[PDB]
């Protein structure tokens, strides 16, 4: 386990979102509202589901070795289905405070899919070159989410109550922030030109995970959004 310089950061990152996912799951703690409960289930899953996933990386089950440049290269294999399942539940949360119709909610689930697919293909290409060919597919994907966060959702929220407007344009602006910084982490770091080295690369996506998992749901559980209107 410490035979790997990293271990540290992915120490670090299981004990954040376990802790998250405690404090969330207590918070949620005698909540009735109907739609409060659903961004209770949906926000606190998230974490729960990092949680499993940074620790299979600190036990190194999530870790598997890809020739590629002559050298075979540590891939954590074990990010790809952390964020399979939570970015499209970070995508909900965010549909599901503006009340978006069921044809946009699909394709954004879908995008994601296809976005988080391709990272995976990318990943465990042995052709050195071809590894770029699945990272700008997967980046137009990220794209069309991105487009739709902006040119979609804050249309509808304008038109619903002030406290979802403003929860979302928040949430939004941290979500095209933070999501837009993987890819140029992953270009640079071990699984791409090799620019940073692990250890500083899964320094980075655990600072980004836990700001986008665990910070963002701070943001949103606080907020009277949740709550339907009631006297
Ligand atoms: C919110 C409060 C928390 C604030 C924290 C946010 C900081 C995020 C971390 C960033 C990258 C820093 C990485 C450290 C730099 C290591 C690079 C290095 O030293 O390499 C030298 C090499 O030997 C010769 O080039
Ligand atoms: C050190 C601590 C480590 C961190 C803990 C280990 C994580 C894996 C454990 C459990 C799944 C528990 C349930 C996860 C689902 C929670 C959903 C929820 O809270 O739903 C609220 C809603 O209001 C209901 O109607
Ligand atoms: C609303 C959506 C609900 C979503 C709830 C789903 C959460 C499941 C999470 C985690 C366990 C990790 C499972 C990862 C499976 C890896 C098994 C595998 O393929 O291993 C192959 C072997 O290691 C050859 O290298
Ligand atoms: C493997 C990747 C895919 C699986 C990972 C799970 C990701 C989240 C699940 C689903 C989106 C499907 C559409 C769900 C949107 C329905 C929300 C809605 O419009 O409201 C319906 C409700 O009946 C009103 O009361
Ligand atoms: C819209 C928000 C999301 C946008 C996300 C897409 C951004 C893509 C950016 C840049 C490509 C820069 C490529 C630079 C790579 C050159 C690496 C190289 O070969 O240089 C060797 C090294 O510099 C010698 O030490
Ligand atoms: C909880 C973790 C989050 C929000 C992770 C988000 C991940 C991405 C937006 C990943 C994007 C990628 C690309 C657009 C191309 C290169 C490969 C990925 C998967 C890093």
Do not use: C, H
């Not at 979609?152 to 941290?174: C, I, Q, W, Y």
Request: net charge neutral; proline share 4%.
């Amino acid at each position: 386990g410490t035979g790997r310089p990293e271990w540290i950061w992915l120490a670090l990152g299981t004990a954040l979102m376990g802790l998250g996912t405690l404090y969330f799951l207590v918070k949620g703690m005698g909540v009735s509202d109907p739609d409060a409960k659903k961004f209770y289930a949906i926000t606190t899953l998230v974490p729960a589901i990092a949680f499993t996933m940074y620790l299979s990386m600190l036990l190194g089950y999530g870790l598997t070795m890809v020739p590629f440049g002559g050298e075979q290269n540590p891939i954590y294999w074990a990010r790809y289905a952390d964020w399979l399942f939570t970015t499209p539940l970070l995508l909900l949360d965010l549909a599901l405070l503006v009340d978006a119709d069921q044809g946009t909610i699909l394709a954004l689930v879908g995008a994601d899919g296809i976005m988080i697919g391709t990272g995976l293909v990318g990943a465990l290409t042995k052709v050195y070159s071809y590894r770029f060919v699945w990272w700008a597919i997967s980046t137009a994907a990220m794209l069309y989410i991105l487009y739709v966060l902006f040119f979609g959702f804050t249309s509808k929220a304008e038109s619903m109550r002030p406290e979802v407007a403003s929860t979302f344009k928040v949430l939004r602006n941290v979500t095209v922030v933070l999501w837009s910084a993987y890819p140029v982490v992953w270009l640079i770091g071990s699984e791409g030109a090799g620019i940073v080295p692990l250890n500083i690369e899964t320094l980075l996506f655990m600072v980004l995970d836990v700001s986008a998992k665990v910070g963002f749901g701070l943001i949103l559980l606080r907020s009277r959004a949740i709550f339907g209107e009631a006297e």
